[PDB]
Amino acid sequence: IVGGRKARPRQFPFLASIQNQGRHFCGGALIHARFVMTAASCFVSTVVLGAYDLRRRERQSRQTFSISSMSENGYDPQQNLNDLMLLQLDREANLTSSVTILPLPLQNATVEAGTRCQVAGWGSQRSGGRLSRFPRFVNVTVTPEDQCRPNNVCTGVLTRRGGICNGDQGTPLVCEGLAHGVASFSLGPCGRGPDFFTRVALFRDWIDGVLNNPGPGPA
Numbered sequence: 693i694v695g696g697r698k699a700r701p702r703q704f705p706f707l708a709s710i711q712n713q714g715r716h717f718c719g720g721a722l723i724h725a726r727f728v729m730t731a732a733s734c735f736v737s738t739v740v741l742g743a744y745d746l747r748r749r750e751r752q753s754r755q756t757f758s759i760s761s762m763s764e765n766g767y768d769p770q771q772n773l774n775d776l777m778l779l780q781l782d783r784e785a786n787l788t789s790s791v792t793i794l795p796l797p798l799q800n801a802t803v804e805a806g807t808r809c810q811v812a813g814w815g816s817q818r819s820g821g822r823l824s825r826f827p828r829f830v831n832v833t834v835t836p837e838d839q840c841r842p843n844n845v846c847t848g849v850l851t852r853r854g855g856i857c858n859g860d861q862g863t864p865l866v867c868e869g870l871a872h873g874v875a876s877f878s879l880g881p882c883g884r885g886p887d888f889f890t891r892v893a894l895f896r897d898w899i900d901g902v903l904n905n906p907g908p909g910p911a
């Protein structure tokens with residue numbers, strides 16, 4: 693996250709740290725006791741919930757999981773289309789003060805331009821920079837459709853540099869308490885704008901289908 697502020701422990705209790713061999717590479721959100729929502733672009737990884745400082749064990753706060761299955765709905769890498777993925781955890785996460793579920797918008801809900809949201813993550817402060825050991829967050833504003841695309845929800849900041857960066861991909865965009873977006877991409881210098889998030893409301897019905905039909909799918 694660029695142009696943000698250090699979060700306090702448990703400030704964003706739904707946050708997920710997706711790691712590869714213990715290295716954080718993407719963010720996500722717990723949207724169900726058994727599922728974490730992230731970006732398809734991000735994809736033996738593990739999912740870490742309840743984390744604060746990436747470099748600390750935090751045994752009494754963290755919950756770690758293996759991914760039992762992954763689901764996507766027409767993801768297209770070339771067009772950055774439908775960049776959304778659901779990771780089924782190896783078991784149910786326990787809901788604690790440090791691990792909570794982030795509610796979703798109803799199918800087709802909208803967020804008008806100018807709506808205030810927040811985005812939090814462990815991403816870097818500049819392209820190619822180091823990750824942030826603590827979670828950081830920034831206030832963002834939904835942009836005019838004209839600056840975005842139907843498949844996404846776009847935001848910007850008032851400052852010259854603020855928004856997502858390396859490692860924030862997959863982290864949720866939270867507006868009016870709901871996960872309206874999934875960090876997908878941003879072009880040029882991080883914070884320049886606008887940030888592109890997959891529009892979650894477009895996938896509500898599909899997500900529901902996944903949540904209600906747990907399992908690895910056809911074998």
Ligand SMILES: *[C@@H]1O[C@H](CO)[C@@H](O[C@@H]2O[C@H](CO)[C@@H](O)[C@H](O)[C@H]2NC(C)=O)[C@H](O)[C@H]1NC(C)=O
Pocket residue numbers: 696697829830831
């Ligand atoms: C997120 O935006 C909120 C809303 O403007 C910011 O909160 C304000 O901060 C200023 C300066 O610290 C205060 O004078 C106001 O009282 C605050 N408003 C409320 C009632 O909290 C907040 O600091 C922004 N956070 C970041 C990460 O941008």
Ligand SMILES: *[C@@H]1O[C@H](CO)[C@@H](O)[C@H](O)[C@H]1NC(C)=O
Pocket residue numbers: 799800
């Ligand atoms: C959501 O909008 C699409 C596209 O306009 C429409 O075809 C679909 O029926 C809507 N879903 C519901 C639940 O309203």
Ligand SMILES: [Cl-]
Pocket residue numbers: 796797798801
């Ligand atoms: Cl809604």
